[PDB]
Every structure is written in C-alpha cells, then in structure tokens.
Amino acid sequence: STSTSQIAVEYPIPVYRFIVSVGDEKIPFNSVSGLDISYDTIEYRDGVGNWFKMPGQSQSTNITLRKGVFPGKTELFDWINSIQLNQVEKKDITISLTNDAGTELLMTWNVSNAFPTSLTSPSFDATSNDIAVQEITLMADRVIMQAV
Amino acid sequence: STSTSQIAVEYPIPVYRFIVSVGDEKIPFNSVSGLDISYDTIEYRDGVGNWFKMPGQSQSTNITLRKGVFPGKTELFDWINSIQLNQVEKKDITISLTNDAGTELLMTWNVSNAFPTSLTSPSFDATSNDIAVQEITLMADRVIMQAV
Amino acid sequence: STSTSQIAVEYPIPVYRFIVSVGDEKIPFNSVSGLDISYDTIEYRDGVGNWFKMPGQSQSTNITLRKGVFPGKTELFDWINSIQLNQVEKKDITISLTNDAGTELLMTWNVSNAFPTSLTSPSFDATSNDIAVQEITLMADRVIMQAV
Amino acid sequence: DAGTELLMTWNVSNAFPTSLTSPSFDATSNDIAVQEITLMADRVIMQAV
Amino acid sequence: DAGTELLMTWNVSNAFPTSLTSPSFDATSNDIAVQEITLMADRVIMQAV
Amino acid sequence: TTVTSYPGVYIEELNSLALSVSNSATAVPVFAVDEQNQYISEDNAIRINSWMDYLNLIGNFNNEDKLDVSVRAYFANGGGYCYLVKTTSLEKIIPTLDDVTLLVAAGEDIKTTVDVLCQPGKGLFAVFDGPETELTINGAEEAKQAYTATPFAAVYYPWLKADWANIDIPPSAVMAGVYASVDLSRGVWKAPANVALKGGLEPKFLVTDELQGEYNTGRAINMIRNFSNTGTTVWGARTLEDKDNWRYVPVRRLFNSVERDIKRAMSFAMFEPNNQPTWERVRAAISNYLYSLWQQGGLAGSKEEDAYFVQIGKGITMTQEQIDAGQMIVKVGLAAVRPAEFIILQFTQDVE
Amino acid sequence: TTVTSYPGVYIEELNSLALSVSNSATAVPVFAVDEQNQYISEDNAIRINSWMDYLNLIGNFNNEDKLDVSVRAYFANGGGYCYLVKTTSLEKIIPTLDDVTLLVAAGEDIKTTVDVLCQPGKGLFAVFDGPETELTINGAEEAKQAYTATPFAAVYYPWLKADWANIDIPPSAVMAGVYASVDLSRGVWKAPANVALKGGLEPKFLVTDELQGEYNTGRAINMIRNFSNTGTTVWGARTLEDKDNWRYVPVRRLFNSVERDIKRAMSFAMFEPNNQPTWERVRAAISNYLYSLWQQGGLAGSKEEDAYFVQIGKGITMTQEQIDAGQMIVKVGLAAVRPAEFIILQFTQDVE
C-alpha cells in the first residue's frame, strides 16, 4: 500500500519525460545523449614503492540532441549555418526530467557555452516507415546536475 | 479530431517521399545518404585556467545516392565515365521531401558542385531475389537546408 | 552564453584565413612560413663578477611562401627570373589574418624589401594524389606586426 | 584551480627578448595562431610557496 | 617489496650537482612537474647485497 | 572642407588631431553640459561615437571651452562612445537611455541631480570633480562637507592641466576614460588607481602625502598626483561612503556591472509563465554567468561555492501570495576582492 | 507592367518590395480605414491575402498614407490575411464575417464601434493606439480617462517610426502581426510581450521606466520601448480592465480562442434531436478539445481534472422546461496560466 506522495520521494525517475531548452527557446527533442563528466588521471610512481593517483585535466563535453524534421521549422539548422570563421553564438542548454504535463521539475542538468558542430541530415529512404530525424552535436563545458 | 490542414502544419515529415534532381535532370532514386554538415573544433587552453572552444575548419561533404539498374538508362555511369584528368562537370543536387504525387515541396536540401567518385556496380548473385542496384558517391560542398 | 561580439574581442585568431599581398598584386597562397624577428646577444663579463647581457645585431628575415601551380599563371617565376646581376625589383609583402570572406582584418604583418631566392619546382610523381605546389623563398628586413 | 594560492614559484631576473616567432599561416590547419618569444636572462631561483 | 632487504647496491663518491632542470609548464599536458638533477662524480662501484 | 573633382590624390596640408577609437562594454559616460552651449539642444542626448564624431558637431577645437578640453582628454585616455546631455534637462534623459553607466560632471554642478537619480536599484555611478581651489590640510573637513555621502560617487581632487588646453581640465572627464581603460585591460573588479594618464596631463596642484591622509578617511576624495617614475597617476579607489561594505569603487562598480548583466538574463524570463520550469531556467542563467565571472577572477573565493549563491523557490523566496501577484524573487550573493591600499615596510638593521 | 511576346527570359529592373506569406489560424485582423480613401468602397470587406495582394489593389506604395505604412508593417511582422473595412460602415460588416478575431484601428477613432460590438459573447478583441502626443508622468491619469474600461481592448502607446515610412506608423497595426507571430511560434496562451519587431521599427518617444509605472496600473497602456540588447520590443500584456479576472491579454485571448473552437464543435449538434445521446456527444467533443489543449500546456493544472470541467445534464444544467423550448446548456471552466510580470532581485554583499 504505497501512497502516491511516497512514490514522489522514494522511487526512481523515468527518462522519457524531459524538457530541453536551448538558450531562450525551448524546443521538443526526441533524445539527448552524451552529457557526461570525465577526468584524465595523473599517476606518479617512484622507486620506494608509493603510487600517487590524482584527478587531472578535465575533458571537453560533447552532447548529441536528436529531433524530427517539422515542415515550417529549421532553427537547429540556422544555428549551425551562422558559423562565420570562429564566431558563433554560444548558448546554454538545460535538460530537465519532469512529470506528466510538466509543471514540476525533478532533476536538472545545465550545459554552458554549447555551440553546434555536425548537423546530420535525414537519410532519405524509399523503403522505410520512419520520420525524418536530425542529430545536432554540441561541444560545451561544465555539465552540472541540479536537484529539482 | 485533428483537421487535415492541422497535420500539414504540426506533424513531422516522413522520409520516404522525396525528389532528387541532378543538374538539369531529375532522376528517381531509391535512397540518399550522408549529406550532413560538420565542423572541426579548435581548442585553446592557457595556464590561468580559461579554456576556449571554437568552431573551426569545415569538413567536405560526401553524399551517397542509391538507384536500381534500368534497361535503357545509364546516366549515372556516363557522368562518372566523363572524368578526364581533373576535369569533370560538377552539378547541383537538390533533395526535396514532397507530398503524395508531389506538386508541393515540404523541405529542400541543396548541394553545390557535386562530382562523382566510386560508382558501385551490382553484386550479381544467382541465389538472390533482389534488383540490380547501384550506389554513386558524390563529393561536394555547402549543404544548405531550405524551408519549403 | 557568449555573445558573438564578445568572441571578436576575447577569442584567439585561427591561422587558416589570411591574405598575402606581394607589392601591388594580391595572390592566394597555401601557406606562409618563417617571418620572425631575431637578435644576437652580446655578453660582457669581467673579473669582479658582473655579467652584462645585451641585445645585439639583428638577423636577416627569411620567409617561405607556398603556392599551388595554376594553368595560366606564373608570376612567382617571372619575379625570380628577372634577376640580373644584383638588380631585382624588391617589393613589400603583407600577411593579414581575416574573417570569413575577408572584409575586415584582424592582424597584419608587414615585410619590407623582399626579393626572391630559391623558387622550388614541384616534384613530379606518378604515384601521388597531390597538387603541383611551389615554394618561393624571400629574404627581407623589418617584419613588423600591426594591430588590425 | 582558480588560483588564489601559490604552490611553487620560479623567479627570473633581467629577462629581455630575442627571437619573437610569428605564426605559421597554413590554409589546411585547424590550429590557433601561436607565438614563441625567447628570453635571455640570469638567476633562476625556485621559491617554496 | 617494502624494502627491508637489499639485493644489489651501487655506490657513487664525491657527487656534486650541475644542471638542475626545471619542469616544462604546459597548459595542455596531464603530467606531474618533474625535475632532473645531473651529478658529476667518480668511482661507481657495484656491491653484492 | 575638401572638394574632389578629378580622381587623383590630394595633398592638402592641415593640422587636425585624430584619436584612435575604442569600444568599451562596461563604461558609457554622460557628460553634463552647461547652458550657454550653442551646439547641443535641450532634452535629447547626442551620442558621440568617436573624437572625429565630436569634431564634426563643433567646427573648431576651442581651448577656452570647458566641454571641449574635457572631451578630448576623455578620448585620449581610451574612452568609448558617450552621450552629451544638457545639465538642466539631465534628469529626464538618463532614465531614457538604457546602457548608461557613468555620470560625469565636466565642471558642472550635478549635486542636485545625483541625489535624485542615484538609487540602490539603478546602475548609475557618478564621478565628479574636487574643488578647483587649492585646498588645505587645515580646513580639510569643511571641504568634505560640501559633498554628499552617497556610495555611488567618487571625487577626484586636482583639476588637471595640459599644454594644448588653455583652461584647466576637470578631472572627472579624464577618469571616465581611465575607468574604460582599466576595465578593458584588467577588468571591472580591478581598481582604477595607479594607472598613468595617456594624454598630456599633469596636476595643477602638487599634493603632499600628509594632505592626502586627511581627505582619504571620511568622505573620501581620491587624488591624482605626480610620481617621478610613473608620471601623473591616479591614487585613490575610495567612494564617498565610509562604511566597510561600499568603501572602494572597484567593489561598487562590480556590483553595478553584475546586476546589469543579470538584468539582461532576466529579460528573457519576462512575461513567461510563473511556474517552476521558469525558475530553474532563471537560476541556471544566473549560475552560468556568476561562474564564468568567478573563473575570470572577478569574485574572491578559493572554492566556487564560496564566491556566490543563487536561491529561487516557492518555499524559499516567494510566497504563494506573491506568485499570484506576478512577482518572482531571486537572492544573489557575491564576494568581491578588496584592493591592497597600504603597504608597510619594516627595515631591520641586523640580518637574522 | 510587363508584356511578354517571345518565350525567352526577361531581365526587367525595378525596385519592388516582397514580403513572405504566413498563415495564421487564430488572428484575423480588420483594419479600420478612414473615409477619403479612394481605393476601398463602403459596406464590403476586401480580403487581402498577402502583401502582393494589397500591392495589386493600390498602384504605388505611398509613404504619406496612414493605411499603407500600417499594412506594410503588419505583413513584415508576420501577419496573415486580413480584411479592409471602412470605418463608418464598420459596424455592419464585422458581424457578417465569421472568422474575424482582431479589430485593429490603424490610426482611427473606433471608440464608438468598440463599445457596441465588443460584448462578452462575441469573440472580438480590439487592439488600438495610444495617443500620438508625447505624454507625461504628470498628467497621466487624464490620458487613461480617454479610453474605455472594457476587458477586450489593449492600448499600445508609442506610434512607431520607420525609415521607409514618411509619417509615423500606428502601433496597433504592428501588434496585429505580433499577435499572429506569437501564437504561431508559442501559442495563444503565451503573452505577446518581450517580442522584437521584425520590421525596421523603433519608437518615436523613448519611455522612462517611471512613466510606465503610472500607466500600467489602472486602465493599462502597454508600451513599446527600446532595449539595447533586444532592439525595439513590446513590454506589456495588460488589458484595459483592472479586475483580477481579465487583467492580461493572454488570458482574454485564450478564452476568446477556446470558445470559438467550441463554437465549431457545437455546430454539428445544431438541429439534432434534443435528448441524452446528443448531450453525451456534445460533452465528448468538448472534452477531447480541452484535453488536447491542456496537453499543449495551454491550461494550467498538474492534474488533468484541475484544468477544466464540462457539465451537461437534465438534472444539472437544463430544466425539462428549457429542453422543450429547444435550449441546451453546457458549463465549461478553464484555468489559464498567468505571465510573470515583475522579477525582484535581492543582491546580498556577504555570501552564506
């Protein structure tokens, strides 16, 4: 006999309900991938036997967002088309696990200074029953995870 | 109760209905692959701690078009056969997602200066129930995506 | 969330976009090398212990410009062919880092009185997939670096 | 990290520049324009903290 | 391992330092700051145990 | 000026001075202009992008004008674009202009307008002049009585003089350019003191160290004095507030700059639905900005959680009553760096 | 224009401006046109599908016309097809046209017609202009007295100006396009404020923040003012009603849009037998629509049963007497989202 407010505190969070917000816009995405912290390890070892292991230089964060093609809207493409030589508008991406008809966040990830590389066009295919989907890849720094 | 003009505005576009147009010709293709933007990333990192990430040098676009073998027609082969030393006729390829019996485009991709490398002959096979298909591979620049 | 005008002020400049201008002409080059200042050091040392280090005589500037072979044009060769005994036309070379489709310079180097030595012909090679390239070497004086 | 505290310190006296090296401009490279400056000096000393 | 017992021994006499080498500071490296010291000496002898 | 009929080239000979342009994101001054100035009109600000832009508005450079010699000293030190508002309509135009940060009196009485527009909410900092007369260590606490005790104001004493200027230059106009030159080279968090003046300036009155000790304490008057190795230089960073919170102009100008940048990030949250998915986007936008400012060294803290904190919430900051009214309350804290102002040397005769 | 005899191609050179077409389901404005307009006739609405459609009706674009510069600013911001009704026959044609939602005064006195056609039953919303004169914070409550206190109206103050337009543009004509651009990109429930104007617009009068505090309270005048990072932008969502029910234009325009869509679902129930199998089809048709609107985020409620309720019945809503008269009574309730209008930052000097 678990109460419905006990499940909100004790139970794990399902992945499939999430909100992605790219800058000031919020746009519906099919899937989000990557988005993990990582560290190189530095190892010193000298002759008397002691072995030092340290966290080292952080690694660059690479995120992949996947989204279907909608008939009026290309604002994933216009972001990657605006790249002149090294100047692009970087913007913050927030992923947020929500409840059904999300008025309440459960977890929140924050990405800083994300800019697009490698927008992937759909694979046109005459014998396929799929939607035209696009992956955009983002390079960024500082994934942080926020409670609620 | 979704109206049929609401589906034209809100719903995603299926991949299987598309028009490929190679230069002045338009020819029916079985599948189109590749056709994505990409960028190298330049990373500067100095001693005080700040880490600069930039979009860098663009990558070359490589497209793969697949097409069945028809009895009178070899004009994918005659394009790749006309390569003398570095001189080939480059032409623009446009992919375009359409409706049923296409009189109306929904999305449009444009490829500039595409020229053929690596025409692939069918694999003749006495125990196979397939059509003779051919892949042609194109190297090009500047994929752009146009709304409608 | 870096703005696109902040990147123009704070971020380092990528090397690959540059304009070379030889005299009144401007010609597209594949790579530019050398082009650095240098100084000999004079060291005095006497018996009481004090050691004087000084900047000394400047060194001659040697630049190497690399360029592919184009079918109608030999004006790197006609410059080095015009050397009669010690008389050659010296001209000023300016390198300039630019933006994409350069209407705006970011940095500028200036070379004075450059004249050609050692034009290098391409290495013809039946098993190579390369372009015919040529290096010209320039001896000059006074590299100066100008902001914007 | 975010340096408010030194761990080691080297000190160089009377350094003056020779041989500033300009970047190698290169149309097929994905690098930043970097410069090396070379300094001649005397008396490197190493200080704890 | 956890040395309470020597297996071989080398002995150097009258060693004095030349050429202490400072670490190469490098913003894109995952290494420890290391130093080499160089010693000039005489009479390396090798002792059993 | 010059009339061009044939293509050619033209080898006109004229003496006109040209100053290089600078772009400053953080310091946009507004020069108070006296009445009996025939060039600018009442009730509109004239944006002057460069010294050449100013030299098109007036025909000749005038040595006798207080406005002319103050604007040339401003652009020679490295100032960006500025506005020119007349002093009687000055209280109407500064609220219209959005990105104005500094308020500069170029030898003008703005003490009436500074009390009514410099508030804790608004981002205006107001540098103005010291008294033109050569003052004393003796009657020193009466000169500090003339100025208000607001934390948003700094007073720089000696009216500078130049060989090109006939009259003495007000020192606040050269300090609008020093503020822009400091923040571009080292940051807003760095104090504008011990910076040399790039123009041909030197103080009218040489100031003893014992006199500067009088004025630095209570309602502090920063002072520009000459050093033989540095030339002329600025030698103060203190505001007119003596309280330990807002004593220094790098701390007051950092908080003015941070809250203006947070203003722009809260601009996108305007007229969005007032629920939790907005508040976790408001907090994430501020937390990115204060982190990258801490990484530049702007905020003082060894640990990142010591430099700042942001708090939004329905239990924390805003009531259910206040949410229905339409309000959204955020709490931000910062930890600025203070400048080292005194250095005490102890010289011992025996080495041990 | 162009005469074509040979097949060929034609490389005519002419400067004509072309604007891209947009289809808007929710916002169909009606532009009030003054008399002494020789192009449209009395007592018929002229549907203008596009800017090219308008540019065929009139020969040249005229800078001096109030109607011309208002229609071009409407299509540049993203407006769909609109109607052109003359202002004296305006009260006869708007009841004829079914799908008209907005009523736009392009610099016209429609205060007589808005009182007689904007009713709680009819779905008309009426955006019109502020006063053309530069107003004051001082005589501010007299300017709100000129406008009626109806909840269906919004007033946008500064008459915009453009480089192509010789005269100043009425601000209501650019807001019919901003209404269509907001509802297509984010929905009718989103307020039309902090949206930049796509045409080359900027306000005639820069508006201080203290002046906007006067006009926002009682009979609210929304204001279009310039921000240095955003450009020109809309900065208000309030109607002319001060009551807490219909304070904001996203809540009033949501209820106008919902009841128009429910109008279409009750169109099929017309002249059907008045018994229970009809009423459970009327309720099911509304319950599908409000659920899919709640799933889009249009109605505010965590639980689906909190956002809306529909009630039909013989015991509940209609009498046995009213059924024999032919009436059918349904009760619908909604819970709209309110926009966050004020954001209060508290900056603390100590981090803890």
JSON list of N, CA and C in Angstrom, two decimals, chain F residues 227-269:
[
{"chain": "F", "resi": 227, "resn": "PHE", "atom": "N", "xyz": [54.23, 61.15, -9.82]},
{"chain": "F", "resi": 227, "resn": "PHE", "atom": "CA", "xyz": [55.35, 60.35, -9.37]},
{"chain": "F", "resi": 227, "resn": "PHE", "atom": "C", "xyz": [56.45, 60.45, -10.42]},
{"chain": "F", "resi": 228, "resn": "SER", "atom": "N", "xyz": [57.71, 60.48, -9.99]},
{"chain": "F", "resi": 228, "resn": "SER", "atom": "CA", "xyz": [58.79, 60.76, -10.93]},
{"chain": "F", "resi": 228, "resn": "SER", "atom": "C", "xyz": [59.06, 59.59, -11.85]},
{"chain": "F", "resi": 229, "resn": "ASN", "atom": "N", "xyz": [58.77, 58.37, -11.42]},
{"chain": "F", "resi": 229, "resn": "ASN", "atom": "CA", "xyz": [58.96, 57.20, -12.27]},
{"chain": "F", "resi": 229, "resn": "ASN", "atom": "C", "xyz": [57.71, 56.86, -13.08]},
{"chain": "F", "resi": 230, "resn": "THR", "atom": "N", "xyz": [56.53, 57.19, -12.58]},
{"chain": "F", "resi": 230, "resn": "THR", "atom": "CA", "xyz": [55.27, 56.85, -13.23]},
{"chain": "F", "resi": 230, "resn": "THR", "atom": "C", "xyz": [54.68, 58.01, -14.04]},
{"chain": "F", "resi": 231, "resn": "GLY", "atom": "N", "xyz": [55.13, 59.24, -13.81]},
{"chain": "F", "resi": 231, "resn": "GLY", "atom": "CA", "xyz": [54.44, 60.38, -14.38]},
{"chain": "F", "resi": 231, "resn": "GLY", "atom": "C", "xyz": [53.27, 60.77, -13.50]},
{"chain": "F", "resi": 232, "resn": "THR", "atom": "N", "xyz": [52.22, 61.29, -14.12]},
{"chain": "F", "resi": 232, "resn": "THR", "atom": "CA", "xyz": [51.00, 61.53, -13.38]},
{"chain": "F", "resi": 232, "resn": "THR", "atom": "C", "xyz": [50.18, 60.24, -13.32]},
{"chain": "F", "resi": 233, "resn": "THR", "atom": "N", "xyz": [49.47, 60.06, -12.21]},
{"chain": "F", "resi": 233, "resn": "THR", "atom": "CA", "xyz": [48.79, 58.80, -11.98]},
{"chain": "F", "resi": 233, "resn": "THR", "atom": "C", "xyz": [47.65, 59.02, -10.99]},
{"chain": "F", "resi": 234, "resn": "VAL", "atom": "N", "xyz": [46.67, 58.13, -11.03]},
{"chain": "F", "resi": 234, "resn": "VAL", "atom": "CA", "xyz": [45.54, 58.16, -10.12]},
{"chain": "F", "resi": 234, "resn": "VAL", "atom": "C", "xyz": [45.92, 57.40, -8.86]},
{"chain": "F", "resi": 235, "resn": "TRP", "atom": "N", "xyz": [45.51, 57.91, -7.71]},
{"chain": "F", "resi": 235, "resn": "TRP", "atom": "CA", "xyz": [46.00, 57.37, -6.45]},
{"chain": "F", "resi": 235, "resn": "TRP", "atom": "C", "xyz": [44.88, 57.17, -5.43]},
{"chain": "F", "resi": 236, "resn": "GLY", "atom": "N", "xyz": [43.71, 56.77, -5.89]},
{"chain": "F", "resi": 236, "resn": "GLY", "atom": "CA", "xyz": [42.61, 56.52, -4.98]},
{"chain": "F", "resi": 236, "resn": "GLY", "atom": "C", "xyz": [41.57, 55.64, -5.62]},
{"chain": "F", "resi": 237, "resn": "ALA", "atom": "N", "xyz": [40.91, 54.84, -4.78]},
{"chain": "F", "resi": 237, "resn": "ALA", "atom": "CA", "xyz": [39.84, 53.97, -5.24]},
{"chain": "F", "resi": 237, "resn": "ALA", "atom": "C", "xyz": [38.61, 54.05, -4.34]},
{"chain": "F", "resi": 238, "resn": "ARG", "atom": "N", "xyz": [38.55, 55.02, -3.44]},
{"chain": "F", "resi": 238, "resn": "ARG", "atom": "CA", "xyz": [37.52, 55.06, -2.42]},
{"chain": "F", "resi": 238, "resn": "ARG", "atom": "C", "xyz": [36.32, 55.89, -2.87]},
{"chain": "F", "resi": 239, "resn": "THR", "atom": "N", "xyz": [35.12, 55.46, -2.47]},
{"chain": "F", "resi": 239, "resn": "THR", "atom": "CA", "xyz": [33.89, 56.19, -2.74]},
{"chain": "F", "resi": 239, "resn": "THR", "atom": "C", "xyz": [33.68, 57.26, -1.67]},
{"chain": "F", "resi": 240, "resn": "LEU", "atom": "N", "xyz": [32.51, 57.88, -1.68]},
{"chain": "F", "resi": 240, "resn": "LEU", "atom": "CA", "xyz": [32.16, 58.84, -0.64]},
{"chain": "F", "resi": 240, "resn": "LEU", "atom": "C", "xyz": [31.51, 58.18, 0.57]},
{"chain": "F", "resi": 241, "resn": "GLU", "atom": "N", "xyz": [31.23, 56.88, 0.51]},
{"chain": "F", "resi": 241, "resn": "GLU", "atom": "CA", "xyz": [30.72, 56.17, 1.67]},
{"chain": "F", "resi": 241, "resn": "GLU", "atom": "C", "xyz": [31.87, 55.61, 2.50]},
{"chain": "F", "resi": 242, "resn": "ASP", "atom": "N", "xyz": [31.83, 55.87, 3.80]},
{"chain": "F", "resi": 242, "resn": "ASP", "atom": "CA", "xyz": [32.87, 55.39, 4.70]},
{"chain": "F", "resi": 242, "resn": "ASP", "atom": "C", "xyz": [32.58, 54.00, 5.26]},
{"chain": "F", "resi": 243, "resn": "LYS", "atom": "N", "xyz": [31.37, 53.47, 5.05]},
{"chain": "F", "resi": 243, "resn": "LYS", "atom": "CA", "xyz": [31.02, 52.15, 5.56]},
{"chain": "F", "resi": 243, "resn": "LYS", "atom": "C", "xyz": [31.87, 51.07, 4.89]},
{"chain": "F", "resi": 244, "resn": "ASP", "atom": "N", "xyz": [32.10, 49.99, 5.63]},
{"chain": "F", "resi": 244, "resn": "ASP", "atom": "CA", "xyz": [33.02, 48.95, 5.18]},
{"chain": "F", "resi": 244, "resn": "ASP", "atom": "C", "xyz": [32.46, 48.11, 4.05]},
{"chain": "F", "resi": 245, "resn": "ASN", "atom": "N", "xyz": [31.17, 48.24, 3.75]},
{"chain": "F", "resi": 245, "resn": "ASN", "atom": "CA", "xyz": [30.57, 47.49, 2.66]},
{"chain": "F", "resi": 245, "resn": "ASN", "atom": "C", "xyz": [30.93, 48.07, 1.31]},
{"chain": "F", "resi": 246, "resn": "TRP", "atom": "N", "xyz": [30.76, 49.38, 1.15]},
{"chain": "F", "resi": 246, "resn": "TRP", "atom": "CA", "xyz": [30.93, 50.03, -0.15]},
{"chain": "F", "resi": 246, "resn": "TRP", "atom": "C", "xyz": [32.04, 51.07, -0.10]},
{"chain": "F", "resi": 247, "resn": "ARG", "atom": "N", "xyz": [33.18, 50.70, 0.47]},
{"chain": "F", "resi": 247, "resn": "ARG", "atom": "CA", "xyz": [34.25, 51.68, 0.66]},
{"chain": "F", "resi": 247, "resn": "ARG", "atom": "C", "xyz": [34.98, 51.98, -0.65]},
{"chain": "F", "resi": 248, "resn": "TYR", "atom": "N", "xyz": [35.15, 50.99, -1.51]},
{"chain": "F", "resi": 248, "resn": "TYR", "atom": "CA", "xyz": [36.00, 51.11, -2.68]},
{"chain": "F", "resi": 248, "resn": "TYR", "atom": "C", "xyz": [35.18, 51.16, -3.97]},
{"chain": "F", "resi": 249, "resn": "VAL", "atom": "N", "xyz": [35.63, 51.96, -4.93]},
{"chain": "F", "resi": 249, "resn": "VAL", "atom": "CA", "xyz": [34.99, 51.99, -6.25]},
{"chain": "F", "resi": 249, "resn": "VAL", "atom": "C", "xyz": [35.14, 50.71, -7.08]},
{"chain": "F", "resi": 250, "resn": "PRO", "atom": "N", "xyz": [36.14, 49.80, -6.92]},
{"chain": "F", "resi": 250, "resn": "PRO", "atom": "CA", "xyz": [36.01, 48.54, -7.66]},
{"chain": "F", "resi": 250, "resn": "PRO", "atom": "C", "xyz": [34.91, 47.63, -7.14]},
{"chain": "F", "resi": 251, "resn": "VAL", "atom": "N", "xyz": [34.56, 47.71, -5.86]},
{"chain": "F", "resi": 251, "resn": "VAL", "atom": "CA", "xyz": [33.50, 46.85, -5.33]},
{"chain": "F", "resi": 251, "resn": "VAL", "atom": "C", "xyz": [32.14, 47.40, -5.72]},
{"chain": "F", "resi": 252, "resn": "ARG", "atom": "N", "xyz": [31.98, 48.72, -5.71]},
{"chain": "F", "resi": 252, "resn": "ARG", "atom": "CA", "xyz": [30.71, 49.32, -6.09]},
{"chain": "F", "resi": 252, "resn": "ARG", "atom": "C", "xyz": [30.45, 49.20, -7.58]},
{"chain": "F", "resi": 253, "resn": "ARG", "atom": "N", "xyz": [31.49, 49.36, -8.40]},
{"chain": "F", "resi": 253, "resn": "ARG", "atom": "CA", "xyz": [31.32, 49.22, -9.84]},
{"chain": "F", "resi": 253, "resn": "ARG", "atom": "C", "xyz": [31.22, 47.78, -10.30]},
{"chain": "F", "resi": 254, "resn": "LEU", "atom": "N", "xyz": [31.71, 46.82, -9.51]},
{"chain": "F", "resi": 254, "resn": "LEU", "atom": "CA", "xyz": [31.48, 45.42, -9.83]},
{"chain": "F", "resi": 254, "resn": "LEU", "atom": "C", "xyz": [30.02, 45.06, -9.63]},
{"chain": "F", "resi": 255, "resn": "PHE", "atom": "N", "xyz": [29.44, 45.48, -8.50]},
{"chain": "F", "resi": 255, "resn": "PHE", "atom": "CA", "xyz": [28.04, 45.18, -8.22]},
{"chain": "F", "resi": 255, "resn": "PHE", "atom": "C", "xyz": [27.11, 45.91, -9.17]},
{"chain": "F", "resi": 256, "resn": "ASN", "atom": "N", "xyz": [27.48, 47.10, -9.64]},
{"chain": "F", "resi": 256, "resn": "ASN", "atom": "CA", "xyz": [26.70, 47.77, -10.67]},
{"chain": "F", "resi": 256, "resn": "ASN", "atom": "C", "xyz": [26.76, 47.02, -11.99]},
{"chain": "F", "resi": 257, "resn": "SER", "atom": "N", "xyz": [27.91, 46.42, -12.30]},
{"chain": "F", "resi": 257, "resn": "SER", "atom": "CA", "xyz": [28.08, 45.75, -13.58]},
{"chain": "F", "resi": 257, "resn": "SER", "atom": "C", "xyz": [27.44, 44.37, -13.57]},
{"chain": "F", "resi": 258, "resn": "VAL", "atom": "N", "xyz": [27.53, 43.66, -12.44]},
{"chain": "F", "resi": 258, "resn": "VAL", "atom": "CA", "xyz": [26.97, 42.31, -12.34]},
{"chain": "F", "resi": 258, "resn": "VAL", "atom": "C", "xyz": [25.45, 42.36, -12.44]},
{"chain": "F", "resi": 259, "resn": "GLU", "atom": "N", "xyz": [24.84, 43.32, -11.77]},
{"chain": "F", "resi": 259, "resn": "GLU", "atom": "CA", "xyz": [23.38, 43.38, -11.73]},
{"chain": "F", "resi": 259, "resn": "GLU", "atom": "C", "xyz": [22.81, 43.89, -13.05]},
{"chain": "F", "resi": 260, "resn": "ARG", "atom": "N", "xyz": [23.62, 44.59, -13.84]},
{"chain": "F", "resi": 260, "resn": "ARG", "atom": "CA", "xyz": [23.20, 44.96, -15.19]},
{"chain": "F", "resi": 260, "resn": "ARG", "atom": "C", "xyz": [23.25, 43.75, -16.12]},
{"chain": "F", "resi": 261, "resn": "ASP", "atom": "N", "xyz": [24.23, 42.87, -15.95]},
{"chain": "F", "resi": 261, "resn": "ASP", "atom": "CA", "xyz": [24.29, 41.67, -16.78]},
{"chain": "F", "resi": 261, "resn": "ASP", "atom": "C", "xyz": [23.21, 40.68, -16.38]},
{"chain": "F", "resi": 262, "resn": "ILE", "atom": "N", "xyz": [22.87, 40.64, -15.09]},
{"chain": "F", "resi": 262, "resn": "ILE", "atom": "CA", "xyz": [21.79, 39.78, -14.63]},
{"chain": "F", "resi": 262, "resn": "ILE", "atom": "C", "xyz": [20.44, 40.33, -15.07]},
{"chain": "F", "resi": 263, "resn": "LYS", "atom": "N", "xyz": [20.35, 41.66, -15.22]},
{"chain": "F", "resi": 263, "resn": "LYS", "atom": "CA", "xyz": [19.18, 42.31, -15.81]},
{"chain": "F", "resi": 263, "resn": "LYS", "atom": "C", "xyz": [18.89, 41.79, -17.21]},
{"chain": "F", "resi": 264, "resn": "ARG", "atom": "N", "xyz": [19.94, 41.57, -18.00]},
{"chain": "F", "resi": 264, "resn": "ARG", "atom": "CA", "xyz": [19.74, 41.12, -19.37]},
{"chain": "F", "resi": 264, "resn": "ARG", "atom": "C", "xyz": [19.33, 39.66, -19.43]},
{"chain": "F", "resi": 265, "resn": "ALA", "atom": "N", "xyz": [19.83, 38.84, -18.50]},
{"chain": "F", "resi": 265, "resn": "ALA", "atom": "CA", "xyz": [19.41, 37.44, -18.46]},
{"chain": "F", "resi": 265, "resn": "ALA", "atom": "C", "xyz": [18.00, 37.31, -17.90]},
{"chain": "F", "resi": 266, "resn": "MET", "atom": "N", "xyz": [17.57, 38.25, -17.08]},
{"chain": "F", "resi": 266, "resn": "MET", "atom": "CA", "xyz": [16.19, 38.14, -16.64]},
{"chain": "F", "resi": 266, "resn": "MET", "atom": "C", "xyz": [15.23, 38.82, -17.60]},
{"chain": "F", "resi": 267, "resn": "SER", "atom": "N", "xyz": [15.75, 39.39, -18.68]},
{"chain": "F", "resi": 267, "resn": "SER", "atom": "CA", "xyz": [14.88, 39.98, -19.68]},
{"chain": "F", "resi": 267, "resn": "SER", "atom": "C", "xyz": [14.13, 38.90, -20.46]},
{"chain": "F", "resi": 268, "resn": "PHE", "atom": "N", "xyz": [14.74, 37.73, -20.66]},
{"chain": "F", "resi": 268, "resn": "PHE", "atom": "CA", "xyz": [14.04, 36.70, -21.43]},
{"chain": "F", "resi": 268, "resn": "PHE", "atom": "C", "xyz": [12.96, 36.03, -20.60]},
{"chain": "F", "resi": 269, "resn": "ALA", "atom": "N", "xyz": [13.09, 36.07, -19.27]},
{"chain": "F", "resi": 269, "resn": "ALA", "atom": "CA", "xyz": [12.09, 35.47, -18.41]},
{"chain": "F", "resi": 269, "resn": "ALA", "atom": "C", "xyz": [10.85, 36.34, -18.26]}
]
